[PDB]
Amino acid sequence: MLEKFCNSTFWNSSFLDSPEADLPLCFEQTVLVWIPLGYLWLLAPWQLLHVYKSRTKRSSTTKLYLAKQVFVGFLLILAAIELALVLTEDSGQATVPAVRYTNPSLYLGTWLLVLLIQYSRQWCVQKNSWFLSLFWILSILCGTFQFQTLIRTLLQGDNSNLAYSCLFFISYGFQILILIFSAFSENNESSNNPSSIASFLSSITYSWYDSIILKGYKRPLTLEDVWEVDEEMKTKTLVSKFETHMKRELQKARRALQSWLMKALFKTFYMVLLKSFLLKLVNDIFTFVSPQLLKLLISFASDRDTYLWIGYLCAILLFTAALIQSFCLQCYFQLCFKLGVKVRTAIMASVYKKALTLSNLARKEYTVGETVNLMSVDAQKLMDVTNFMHMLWSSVLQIVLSIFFLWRELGPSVLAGVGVMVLVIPINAILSTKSKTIQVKNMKNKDKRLKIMNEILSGIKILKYFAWEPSFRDQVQNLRKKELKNLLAFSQLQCVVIFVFQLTPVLVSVVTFSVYVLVDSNNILDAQKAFTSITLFNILRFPLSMLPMMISSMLQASVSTERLEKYLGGDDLDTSAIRHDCNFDKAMQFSEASFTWEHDSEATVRDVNLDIMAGQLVAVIGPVGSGKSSLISAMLGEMENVHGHITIKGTTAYVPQQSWIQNGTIKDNILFGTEFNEKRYQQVLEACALLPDLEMLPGGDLAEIGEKGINLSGGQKQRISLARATYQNLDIYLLDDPLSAVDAHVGKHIFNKVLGPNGLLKGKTRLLVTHSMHFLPQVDEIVVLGNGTIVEKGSYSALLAKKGEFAKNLKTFLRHTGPEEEATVHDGSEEEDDDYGLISSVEEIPEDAASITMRRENSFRRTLSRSSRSNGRHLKSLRNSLKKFSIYLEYLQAIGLFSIFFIILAFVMNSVAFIGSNLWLSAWTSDSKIFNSTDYPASQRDMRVGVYGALGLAQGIFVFIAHFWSAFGFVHASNILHKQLLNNILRAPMRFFDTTPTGRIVNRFAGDISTVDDTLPQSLRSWITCFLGIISTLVMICMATPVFTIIVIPLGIIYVSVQMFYVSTSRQLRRLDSVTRSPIYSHFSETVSGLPVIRAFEHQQRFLKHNEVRIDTNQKCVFSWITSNRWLAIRLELVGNLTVFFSALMMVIYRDTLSGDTVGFVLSNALNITQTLNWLVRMTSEIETNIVAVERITEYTKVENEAPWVTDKRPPPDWPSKGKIQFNNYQVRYRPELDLVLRGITCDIGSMEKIGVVGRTGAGKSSLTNCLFRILEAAGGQIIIDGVDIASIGLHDLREKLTIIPQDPILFSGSLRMNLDPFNNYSDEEIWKALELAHLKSFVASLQLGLSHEVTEAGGNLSIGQRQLLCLGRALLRKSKILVLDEATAAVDLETDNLIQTTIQNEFAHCTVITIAHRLHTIMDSDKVMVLDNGKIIECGSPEELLQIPGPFYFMAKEAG
């Protein structure tokens, strides 16, 4: 056939098996040419059909496009001229071969298609494509054999066919220029993201992403510098696609009632997974093509007769094997994890949509925490199962295929070797469940220290008054003792679990080799049959060592997925009872509607019938719990129907009993996403009397409101909530108790200006439900609700004339009273820090994946423990009155320097046994060539395994002492680190606490300490063991080939530059990731608090729009660091591959002296470089991130300090004896940059003198008390007490002798007794004596547990007056000579105030009392009165002396009666 076609042979082994293997000619230009030619003409319709489907506008012709187009035009000229010569040469009566002129014809036709495709390539978004990029690269490789064939023939003094060669030479020359130009990608200015613009070669090598990383290396990143993620991954598009199949599956699920979500995703995403399933096989096949190539290459160096060319081909094929394997692998991770974010984006938005539509009956079971738990953890769990769908089938594929290779290779002895691998899993199982048992048991102890520390932080000042800090310092330290005892057992578990994982590849190598050489047979070992095996086990572990992990994960996902089904599959609210009419004569009407909360429960509203005209003012009243708040719920549609219907017209405005507020500004909340109209905006503020309050607020209307309005008083929240309703200008207004929390005068103002017959809402229908009675005469009609039914209705005069139950209840509760509340503080805290980032999937980097598995559970448990609280903050505006190398060095300083320098020695001395084992094993394999069959002595040639076993156990003992010893260092470091914080922040000045909101201190003492002893300890063991493994293997490569160490330098510099750029960018994206994720959780928690409000204004669509862009703002960055993470392996395995691919050439070209065994180790473990060298940078990323916790620890542990608690000049034990107080020109300031609040007070307090202090607010009255106890240190002047200066005495030598009754009663969680006597210095009868004196004996005895009764947080289980009375018992307990009162009766009823006051003159007559009170009559009994204004004393005299003088005290007394 082809013999006559070429007048030459097809191919023969004679041409092959030669020292210079020359590929037969005719086979070249007839077979290999048919590969790219056949590649084009078959798939050519597929591309043009695909392009013709999507026709667009043509793009501008860049000079680059003209360049690659005309170059192909030259190729046609190339085809033209060469076709001409063969026809002319045929005139010489020579029968030219058919291939000579048929080859151009094929080229002639095919290049026109290239012109056609290139010309048509303009319209597509992608200026290049795989169908072209692969064609050029395939043509070069498939034309390379022709290239080397032509050159060698012509070099041997042959120029007969020179014309064909040179034209072909330049023909090959132009093809490569096409590729180097086609691979280049031009920006068409169409899309911000180069993802749709980058050429195919850039799409794999990720050269397009260099823009971000290069930009990141210059200046800190920002949200706008990260592009929005394409058009496909738009959350709205994702939601619509998923929900279509979701509802269909739900409908079929309903039919089964006479579980689906995992099926639903497959029905929708089967296209995406296929692109990875077909690709994952290509990966696995090329993982095993290397060890097969090892056997060929190792055998090459065994004997000398091998042709030189086989070595180079093996080396080159080794190179391309990795590149194909590398490209698909990263094209797999990037595609698979793109699904990982894709799936979560669907459910996270989908659950939000279902949230606004669920029936409240379903919500009656879930709290606020449970609903957000779906996205906090349950949605997050759906990534990990999704992050490995292909791994469930891949893992079983590798293990069985690996067995087949080794079983065919090594023999039926590895069953024990793979057998011991199987038996590893039971150890991993038992240790894992033991670890889980103790860590969850550690949480209960962990949260206790957190809760205990919340209450001390809130009331640090109160502790400073009495100096209880040593008691709490030992209390927390004692609690920390139970922390480490559980922790050490946990850490001792982790060193064992990493032991079995790390040791097993060595152990199996010992067992597998020992058995084969020692079975009763003539068994020989050599390099080729040994070194291929060890590579297989390196491949084998990862699919097998992770096998228990996904099984746990699948069960872990099983509980999570079911919770989603019960939520999403839950029913929706039934709005059929609510009828919306546009022509109904009334605003609203009842039609015998009976409503019940639960279908099995009784009806809360029974057969009630009303009818309200449009624009009327109607009042609905009734006893508490009669169903008043329930009737309004019927209007909202949240109330279930039994029978009847309701007709409502127009938009409705609603205000709940408990005000719901959003996060933002006051202007934003009232605006509610509408349009700002200033004239209405000013009118509504005046009408709702918000003007006096915004003036009080420092930021005015633009002031940021705290979460749930903690920055705002409860009474105000009702006013803004009502003000929000007024701005909307709706039709129906429902006013569920809008005036109870406001003042009577303000209630008069809001009614007249908004609600009354002169209000802004005169023309609108208004339904008010109120508890007050004075506004009813101004109401058009009054309805009374009784027992869920209406009793009487009519006008105020008619109901009064009827003498009904309203008249009976008219005389009773004429007024209802109710004071106001004050709150003017801000909360600054952040708890969004994580420890799992940078790793989306376990298979990303599997060297030691046991570490990352614990991180997922560690992060899940801490985010599940959402229970956290504070106590209070009275009126502080911001802080005002008037209410790299060295850090790790320090870290390792905490670790015992003795231990740290030997555990590192153990790791390095672990490696020498590792490297010796491989070294000496190579010498063992030399036995095969030097010994004939049955020539080895059975004893002295089998003693080798004894050495291997000894070094095998050396691999264990060396690292057993390493990991186990590191456990002690880690727990010891955590102890000394934790002591440093408690020894300082407790000792830290309160001025530091003044400028620092408690939120930072809470998270720093909790979040940072949590990771430093849990996450960081596991990551360090990871980092050294990989680095030393790398150093061990290259230091072995260098001794085998000394030339290698020279070529390391170019590889070293490129590597360190790459890792520098990534850590300079990947570090920032994590912080940006955290700051955008928390609003999503915050937003959901924000809206779920106010669902009944949302359907009232029908703004459902706006929130979906609002959430749709917020989640996009988040997921646009998580996708942006996945590519950066993928950016490594492509640009770093090309470093890993060259350091192993180059090795092959040096061994090949040094074959004249190396042996067969020598090339084994230098190349065997060299295949472990790629998958482990990249593991190094991944750890380096986390270390540079998680160390910021230690950064933040160092900042707080170096803060300032007060004077020592105890000084050398201790006071006499009886001191104070008289309680005399002397002030001399005393000046202080809150901060050095702030002005002097106190301005030189000089006063003398006689013994046994009662002094009351009066003055305006913030006149230093509270400051002076702080000065007495030395909270604010002396800026100038001094205080002398009983002839002794307090400056020279320590704080703990003076604070025990003085007593204060604080205005704010902060109490300590625990028993009653510890709240009174934490030091246990007094007996129970003395405590009982104090309680009866404080008049608490009846109440405390009434408690079931008596003096041991538990105290809730901030004393939430006790009333305000009791807490004043309880702290009064503290003063009676101490019996200090000096007593100070500072607004102790602000929130005390007059009865208890008299009781509190009575306890003063009787039990404190023999003590000096300083009283500060806004209540003047409480000071009339004081012997002396101090008037403090603007930091100075103005008047000094007795109350009767000051009353006669017309001064500020007389004026204040005039104001107070």
Side-chain angles (χ1 to χ4, degrees), residues 1-865 872 884-1457:
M1 185 180 288
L2 207 60
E3 302 288 326
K4 55 97 179 178
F5 197 90
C6 288
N7 201 1
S8 73
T9 187
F10 187 40
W11 72 268
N12 313 90
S13 303
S14 86
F15 292 167
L16 205 58
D17 286 25
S18 54
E20 271 306 323
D22 193 2
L23 172 43
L25 183 63
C26 172
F27 172 89
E28 182 65 26
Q29 68 273 15
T30 55
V31 175
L32 294 174
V33 298
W34 286 15
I35 301 299
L37 277 296
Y39 167 54
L40 294 174
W41 291 71
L42 172 44
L43 277 296
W46 208 246
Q47 275 296 320
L48 61 83
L49 264 71
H50 184 275
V51 172
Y52 193 54
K53 179 180 179 181
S54 70
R55 300 308 312 286
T56 65
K57 286 84 62 182
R58 210 195 279 245
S59 72
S60 63
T61 49
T62 177
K63 308 288 307 194
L64 271 298
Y65 164 99
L66 190 51
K68 54 202 161 273
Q69 198 71 276
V70 65
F71 262 60
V72 192
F74 263 99
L75 203 72
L76 275 299
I77 297 169
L78 268 294
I81 187 74
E82 60 86 19
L83 173 44
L85 66 94
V86 292
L87 270 299
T88 59
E89 280 183 351
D90 189 79
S91 309
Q93 295 179 357
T95 55
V96 295
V99 64
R100 284 313 284 204
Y101 50 91
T102 48
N103 189 359
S105 179
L106 300 170
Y107 271 9
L108 188 153
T110 187
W111 300 140
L112 267 298
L113 282 72
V114 183
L115 277 296
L116 188 153
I117 296 305
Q118 286 277 271
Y119 193 82
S120 69
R121 199 77 256 167
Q122 280 162 339
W123 277 287
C124 182
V125 186
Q126 265 282 309
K127 259 57 187 171
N128 280 114
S129 176
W130 55 272
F131 176 68
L132 275 296
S133 45
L134 282 71
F135 160 64
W136 299 119
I137 187 68
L138 195 141
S139 167
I140 297 169
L141 280 293
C142 275
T144 308
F145 297 158
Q146 194 147 304
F147 194 48
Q148 213 74 50
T149 311
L150 264 292
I151 190 167
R152 269 200 278 129
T153 57
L154 71 88
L155 294 174
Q156 297 304 112
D158 199 338
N159 315 313
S160 52
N161 211 6
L162 183 63
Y164 182 35
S165 50
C166 52
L167 277 296
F168 182 79
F169 187 13
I170 199 64
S171 162
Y172 206 72
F174 273 20
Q175 277 157 104
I176 190 167
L177 273 296
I178 300 301
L179 191 143
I180 197 65
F181 272 9
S182 69
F184 204 50
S185 181
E186 61 86 20
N187 190 2
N188 59 3
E189 311 325 300
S190 296
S191 82
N192 66 331
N193 53 3
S195 43
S196 296
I197 317 300
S199 51
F200 182 86
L201 276 296
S202 48
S203 179
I204 288 304
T205 49
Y206 296 144
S207 70
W208 60 273
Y209 203 58
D210 281 278
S211 69
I212 290 297
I213 190 167
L214 194 143
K215 181 68 173 65
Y217 176 68
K218 203 174 312 305
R219 55 163 281 300
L221 281 294
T222 184
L223 304 93
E224 40 270 41
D225 218 338
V226 165
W227 314 291
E228 190 276 331
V229 298
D230 73 2
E231 301 165 330
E232 171 49 53
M233 281 196 328
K234 179 55 66 67
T235 73
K236 183 45 73 179
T237 301
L238 274 75
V239 162
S240 62
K241 294 306 290 316
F242 159 67
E243 61 86 20
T244 51
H245 313 94
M246 183 278 288
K247 68 168 76 67
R248 269 176 279 192
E249 294 294 328
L250 266 290
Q251 289 310 315
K252 303 315 184 90
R254 304 292 71 62
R255 299 182 185 175
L257 305 166
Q258 298 173 335
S259 303
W260 34 261
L261 190 145
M262 279 320 269
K263 278 98 171 155
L265 305 190
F266 288 167
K267 298 293 188 291
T268 314
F269 286 74
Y270 63 73
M271 299 199 218
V272 181
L273 70 88
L274 209 76
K275 297 183 182 67
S276 54
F277 187 45
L278 188 142
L279 192 147
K280 191 67 175 176
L281 294 174
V282 176
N283 195 327
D284 291 331
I285 293 301
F286 277 61
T287 61
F288 292 89
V289 72
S290 301
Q292 203 204 80
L293 188 153
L294 274 291
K295 186 85 170 186
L296 267 75
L297 182 153
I298 297 308
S299 46
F300 151 78
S302 183
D303 57 355
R304 304 288 186 185
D305 62 354
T306 61
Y307 290 145
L308 184 63
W309 64 264
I310 194 76
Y312 293 99
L313 188 153
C314 287
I316 288 307
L317 266 293
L318 183 63
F319 182 76
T320 187
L323 273 295
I324 301 299
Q325 199 272 332
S326 294
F327 285 172
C328 65
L329 177 48
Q330 297 312 291
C331 201
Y332 165 78
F333 286 166
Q334 188 274 331
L335 161 73
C336 188
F337 309 150
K338 189 167 73 69
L339 157 71
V341 55
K342 209 169 280 195
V343 55
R344 188 213 46 186
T345 298
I347 62 170
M348 185 179 288
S350 183
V351 64
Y352 182 76
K353 184 195 302 315
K354 180 64 178 66
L356 273 54
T357 71
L358 57 91
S359 71
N360 48 4
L361 169 62
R363 192 180 67 249
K364 290 172 74 172
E365 187 271 320
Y366 313 82
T367 66
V368 57
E370 293 180 354
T371 313
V372 75
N373 276 337
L374 319 176
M375 294 182 286
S376 70
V377 65
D378 291 331
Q380 283 313 349
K381 295 169 76 173
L382 271 195
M383 310 215 178
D384 273 1
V385 65
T386 300
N387 281 121
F388 41 95
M389 290 315 168
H390 296 288
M391 197 175 150
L392 62 83
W393 71 250
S394 82
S395 170
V396 69
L397 183 63
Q398 294 105 25
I399 62 170
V400 298
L401 188 153
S402 63
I403 289 297
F404 181 41
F405 280 173
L406 59 85
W407 204 16
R408 179 67 179 171
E409 182 272 322
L410 199 149
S413 66
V414 191
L415 188 151
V418 65
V420 65
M421 270 314 170
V422 174
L423 277 296
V424 176
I425 308 307
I427 297 89
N428 264 327
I430 172 175
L431 277 296
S432 75
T433 190
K434 286 305 168 39
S435 66
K436 172 193 286 155
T437 296
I438 55 179
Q439 58 90 16
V440 75
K441 273 167 56 139
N442 194 2
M443 271 325 307
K444 64 100 178 179
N445 265 6
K446 172 62 70 179
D447 58 55
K448 275 190 291 188
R449 190 189 80 257
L450 188 153
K451 299 294 187 291
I452 297 299
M453 201 185 218
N454 289 120
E455 57 86 18
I456 62 170
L457 264 288
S458 65
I460 292 168
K461 188 76 176 298
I462 297 89
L463 277 76
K464 305 310 295 303
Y465 288 121
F466 293 99
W468 310 106
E469 54 264 11
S471 68
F472 272 105
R473 202 206 69 259
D474 291 331
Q475 192 277 331
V476 179
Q477 279 200 14
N478 189 359
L479 191 41
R480 197 84 187 146
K481 177 256 288 183
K482 281 87 72 177
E483 282 325 319
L484 269 72
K485 184 165 74 175
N486 193 3
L487 183 63
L488 188 153
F490 184 79
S491 181
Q492 202 202 328
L493 188 153
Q494 311 310 139
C495 65
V496 182
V497 72
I498 189 167
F499 203 69
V500 188
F501 184 110
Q502 189 275 331
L503 211 53
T504 176
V506 163
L507 172 61
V508 58
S509 64
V510 176
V511 170
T512 304
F513 273 106
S514 69
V515 298
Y516 174 49
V517 67
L518 290 199
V519 294
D520 295 322
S521 163
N522 189 8
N523 321 109
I524 320 295
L525 276 298
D526 48 47
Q528 40 166 303
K529 82 190 292 185
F531 264 80
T532 177
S533 66
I534 62 171
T535 52
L536 294 174
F537 315 123
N538 290 109
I539 301 299
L540 160 76
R541 303 195 328 294
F542 294 159
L544 183 62
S545 79
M546 295 298 102
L547 204 56
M549 172 295 308
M550 61 214 88
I551 305 301
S552 65
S553 306
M554 172 275 257
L555 277 296
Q556 188 178 2
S558 68
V559 55
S560 168
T561 185
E562 171 59 9
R563 302 166 67 182
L564 273 297
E565 319 309 300
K566 189 67 49 176
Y567 184 108
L568 269 75
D571 75 291
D572 63 358
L573 74 164
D574 189 10
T575 61
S576 67
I578 297 294
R579 301 184 181 173
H580 291 283
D581 190 3
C582 295
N583 297 345
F584 182 51
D585 280 337
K586 319 305 180 299
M588 61 79 71
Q589 168 170 68
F590 273 21
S591 298
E592 55 272 8
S594 279
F595 292 166
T596 184
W597 285 96
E598 303 179 356
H599 62 279
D600 56 352
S601 70
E602 276 313 274
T604 315
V605 183
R606 295 178 179 93
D607 77 324
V608 174
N609 283 302
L610 277 296
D611 199 67
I612 302 177
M613 311 315 88
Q616 270 190 322
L617 180 57
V618 57
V620 176
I621 53 176
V624 185
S626 69
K628 308 180 298 288
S629 314
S630 308
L631 195 146
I632 68 154
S633 178
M635 295 298 102
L636 294 174
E638 316 314 304
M639 187 66 203
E640 186 268 0
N641 184 9
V642 185
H643 63 92
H645 70 103
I646 298 161
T647 311
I648 305 178
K649 279 197 70 173
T651 56
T652 181
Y654 167 61
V655 60
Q657 192 173 18
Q658 69 276 17
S659 44
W660 168 76
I661 193 66
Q662 292 180 356
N663 290 318
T665 72
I666 296 92
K667 186 173 190 147
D668 294 319
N669 269 273
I670 190 167
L671 187 153
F672 208 69
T674 55
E675 184 40 55
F676 170 69
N677 195 336
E678 54 94 19
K679 65 181 74 65
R680 182 182 178 123
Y681 188 96
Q682 271 75 72
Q683 279 168 344
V684 65
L685 290 185
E686 181 194 343
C688 311
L690 265 295
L691 304 178
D693 305 297
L694 58 88
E695 287 145 4
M696 183 278 288
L697 294 174
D701 66 329
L702 295 178
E704 170 63 31
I705 187 52
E707 201 174 359
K708 300 182 177 178
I710 199 165
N711 307 355
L712 186 63
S713 72
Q716 283 298 117
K717 294 178 199 180
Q718 206 169 17
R719 269 173 288 246
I720 296 89
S721 190
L722 199 165
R724 163 183 55 203
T726 315
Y727 192 86
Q728 299 294 332
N729 215 26
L730 303 190
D731 291 331
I732 303 301
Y733 284 76
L734 294 174
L735 277 296
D736 186 74
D737 185 73
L739 60 84
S740 53
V742 304
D743 289 302
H745 182 283
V746 185
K748 193 175 183 180
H749 180 88
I750 182 63
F751 193 88
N752 293 343
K753 295 287 186 168
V754 165
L755 294 174
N758 301 334
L760 284 185
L761 305 184
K762 282 175 282 291
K764 306 301 199 140
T765 299
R766 303 165 302 284
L767 189 152
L768 61 83
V769 174
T770 187
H771 189 68
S772 308
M773 185 180 288
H774 42 262
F775 296 125
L776 282 71
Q778 303 184 38
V779 184
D780 299 314
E781 192 275 337
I782 301 166
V783 171
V784 188
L785 178 64
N787 298 337
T789 58
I790 47 164
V791 188
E792 284 165 43
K793 77 173 186 178
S795 68
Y796 183 83
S797 54
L799 292 185
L800 186 65
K802 281 179 178 180
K803 295 184 179 177
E805 49 86 22
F806 181 76
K808 298 177 183 178
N809 311 331
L810 189 137
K811 61 183 75 65
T812 304
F813 46 88
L814 280 164
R815 297 88 167 189
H816 304 290
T817 70
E820 281 284 356
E821 201 83 27
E822 210 181 83
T824 309
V825 300
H826 182 81
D827 294 331
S829 74
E830 276 93 4
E831 63 276 10
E832 62 270 12
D833 302 330
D834 52 356
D835 61 284
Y836 195 79
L838 294 175
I839 296 90
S840 295
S841 193
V842 62
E843 66 252 58
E844 293 179 353
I845 193 66
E847 161 163 350
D848 291 331
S851 171
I852 193 66
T853 54
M854 261 315 288
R855 308 279 173 79
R856 198 75 181 150
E857 174 78 346
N858 190 4
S859 195
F860 278 178
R861 199 47 49 71
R862 94 181 281 201
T863 190
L864 272 174
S865 62
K884 297 286 183 187
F885 60 98
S886 63
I887 298 85
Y888 316 99
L889 294 174
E890 173 60 32
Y891 182 76
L892 282 72
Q893 284 279 2
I895 294 92
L897 194 143
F898 289 168
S899 197
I900 193 66
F901 206 71
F902 312 156
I903 62 170
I904 193 66
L905 182 74
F907 276 112
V908 71
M909 171 294 268
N910 182 15
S911 291
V912 298
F914 183 37
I915 193 66
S917 178
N918 296 115
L919 179 141
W920 160 80
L921 188 153
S922 172
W924 184 25
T925 51
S926 79
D927 272 346
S928 61
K929 62 201 60 53
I930 56 170
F931 275 94
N932 188 31
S933 73
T934 69
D935 201 11
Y936 63 93
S939 50
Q940 212 164 359
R941 285 274 65 70
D942 289 2
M943 51 66 78
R944 286 290 170 78
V945 301
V947 176
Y948 201 63
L951 277 296
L953 301 203
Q955 294 296 110
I957 301 299
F958 292 166
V959 66
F960 182 76
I961 312 297
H963 279 99
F964 168 84
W965 207 4
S966 62
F968 291 145
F970 292 163
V971 302
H972 178 273
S974 175
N975 198 349
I976 186 52
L977 204 43
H978 197 276
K979 297 288 184 66
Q980 271 268 24
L981 282 72
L982 183 63
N983 266 355
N984 189 179
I985 62 170
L986 187 153
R987 173 74 76 179
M990 72 291 291
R991 188 226 48 73
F992 151 81
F993 293 118
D994 291 331
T995 187
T996 52
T998 78
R1000 282 98 61 82
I1001 317 301
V1002 165
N1003 62 58
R1004 292 262 285 256
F1005 208 101
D1008 291 331
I1009 198 66
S1010 53
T1011 74
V1012 70
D1013 57 6
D1014 291 331
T1015 70
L1016 202 76
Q1018 183 66 41
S1019 179
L1020 274 297
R1021 297 172 178 178
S1022 178
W1023 189 96
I1024 296 89
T1025 191
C1026 182
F1027 176 87
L1028 268 64
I1030 297 314
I1031 301 301
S1032 59
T1033 183
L1034 294 71
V1035 75
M1036 187 66 204
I1037 296 169
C1038 81
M1039 81 175 258
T1041 63
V1043 65
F1044 204 110
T1045 181
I1046 312 295
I1047 208 74
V1048 167
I1049 297 169
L1051 277 296
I1053 181 62
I1054 190 167
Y1055 160 86
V1056 298
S1057 62
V1058 160
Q1059 74 94 4
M1060 187 66 204
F1061 278 175
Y1062 181 75
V1063 71
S1064 173
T1065 300
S1066 172
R1067 169 169 54 187
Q1068 302 188 27
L1069 268 72
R1070 310 174 49 54
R1071 171 204 35 74
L1072 191 151
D1073 190 359
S1074 284
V1075 302
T1076 180
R1077 167 170 281 165
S1078 66
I1080 294 297
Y1081 291 165
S1082 178
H1083 198 308
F1084 201 79
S1085 66
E1086 175 147 357
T1087 175
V1088 298
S1089 53
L1091 319 182
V1093 172
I1094 309 316
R1095 275 82 66 191
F1097 304 90
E1098 309 290 345
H1099 275 80
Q1100 307 169 176
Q1101 175 48 44
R1102 198 256 317 279
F1103 289 165
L1104 277 296
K1105 178 67 174 66
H1106 188 280
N1107 191 349
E1108 190 277 331
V1109 69
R1110 192 155 288 196
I1111 188 167
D1112 186 74
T1113 317
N1114 188 359
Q1115 68 93 0
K1116 82 193 179 79
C1117 74
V1118 64
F1119 174 86
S1120 176
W1121 70 268
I1122 293 298
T1123 77
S1124 70
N1125 197 14
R1126 304 300 51 71
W1127 152 260
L1128 263 292
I1130 301 299
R1131 284 287 209 184
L1132 172 83
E1133 293 179 353
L1134 269 67
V1135 159
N1137 290 318
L1138 294 174
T1139 189
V1140 56
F1141 153 73
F1142 273 10
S1143 70
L1145 306 92
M1146 283 74 75
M1147 273 85 82
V1148 162
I1149 71 164
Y1150 293 10
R1151 186 218 35 77
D1152 280 335
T1153 176
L1154 277 296
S1155 76
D1157 63 358
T1158 45
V1159 299
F1161 63 89
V1162 65
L1163 183 62
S1164 78
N1165 63 7
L1167 277 296
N1168 296 115
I1169 296 299
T1170 61
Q1171 186 36 269
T1172 61
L1173 189 151
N1174 79 330
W1175 163 285
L1176 183 63
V1177 67
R1178 214 51 71 71
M1179 310 314 88
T1180 315
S1181 66
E1182 306 216 71
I1183 300 300
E1184 207 71 19
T1185 296
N1186 314 337
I1187 210 75
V1188 68
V1190 159
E1191 291 325 326
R1192 283 184 301 249
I1193 292 302
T1194 61
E1195 172 190 9
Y1196 279 167
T1197 192
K1198 209 180 284 292
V1199 306
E1200 205 45 44
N1201 181 342
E1202 300 93 4
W1205 285 334
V1206 175
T1207 59
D1208 70 328
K1209 287 306 299 170
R1210 294 202 185 199
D1214 47 21
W1215 200 107
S1217 60
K1218 300 176 184 179
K1220 188 180 181 181
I1221 301 299
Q1222 292 180 318
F1223 292 165
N1224 296 326
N1225 57 26
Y1226 190 15
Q1227 305 91 17
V1228 285
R1229 60 185 68 179
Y1230 270 93
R1231 264 195 280 204
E1233 58 270 57
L1234 291 176
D1235 292 332
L1236 289 169
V1237 177
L1238 188 63
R1239 298 178 181 180
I1241 301 296
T1242 303
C1243 177
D1244 193 352
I1245 304 184
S1247 187
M1248 282 326 98
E1249 191 172 26
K1250 304 321 176 280
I1251 292 175
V1253 175
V1254 301
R1256 309 187 68 190
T1257 182
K1261 57 183 186 295
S1262 297
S1263 296
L1264 186 69
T1265 61
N1266 307 317
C1267 300
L1268 279 167
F1269 292 10
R1270 307 207 298 168
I1271 296 89
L1272 304 174
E1273 284 286 351
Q1278 63 187 1
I1279 291 173
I1280 305 174
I1281 295 182
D1282 277 357
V1284 180
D1285 182 19
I1286 69 174
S1288 71
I1289 317 163
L1291 294 174
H1292 274 201
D1293 292 323
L1294 61 84
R1295 293 171 177 166
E1296 71 277 17
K1297 300 296 191 164
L1298 283 72
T1299 307
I1300 179 64
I1301 294 91
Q1303 72 279 16
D1304 197 71
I1306 193 66
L1307 277 296
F1308 293 163
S1309 294
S1311 65
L1312 294 174
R1313 180 195 169 83
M1314 61 79 71
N1315 273 279
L1316 274 299
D1317 191 7
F1319 289 103
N1320 190 359
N1321 296 347
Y1322 264 50
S1323 63
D1324 284 326
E1325 58 89 19
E1326 283 163 309
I1327 290 175
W1328 270 128
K1329 187 69 174 67
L1331 294 174
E1332 59 91 17
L1333 292 174
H1335 310 281
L1336 266 297
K1337 185 166 179 183
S1338 56
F1339 172 72
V1340 178
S1342 78
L1343 303 175
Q1344 296 179 358
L1345 204 66
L1347 60 86
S1348 295
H1349 181 74
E1350 69 282 6
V1351 182
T1352 54
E1353 47 274 17
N1357 57 342
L1358 310 177
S1359 84
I1360 298 314
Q1362 288 163 349
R1363 262 86 63 82
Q1364 291 311 59
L1365 279 170
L1366 183 63
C1367 292
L1368 188 153
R1370 290 166 162 167
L1372 296 162
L1373 186 141
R1374 303 176 76 205
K1375 306 181 183 175
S1376 65
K1377 280 300 194 180
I1378 297 168
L1379 191 70
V1380 176
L1381 307 170
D1382 52 354
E1383 203 80 345
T1385 69
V1388 185
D1389 51 327
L1390 73 163
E1391 184 177 357
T1392 310
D1393 180 19
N1394 284 340
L1395 292 172
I1396 288 166
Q1397 283 288 342
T1398 314
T1399 300
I1400 289 160
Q1401 74 275 16
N1402 296 295
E1403 292 82 3
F1404 300 110
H1406 65 280
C1407 306
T1408 304
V1409 184
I1410 300 176
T1411 308
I1412 288 174
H1414 91 288
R1415 189 69 264 175
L1416 188 148
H1417 76 72
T1418 59
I1419 305 180
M1420 293 177 71
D1421 299 340
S1422 307
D1423 308 314
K1424 206 78 171 295
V1425 177
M1426 295 298 102
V1427 193
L1428 272 168
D1429 275 12
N1430 70 22
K1432 296 181 181 178
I1433 46 169
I1434 292 174
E1435 290 156 319
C1436 183
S1438 79
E1440 58 88 19
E1441 281 167 358
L1442 296 180
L1443 274 171
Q1444 294 170 21
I1445 303 168
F1449 182 76
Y1450 166 78
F1451 292 162
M1452 281 205 218
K1454 191 177 183 180
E1455 297 140 24

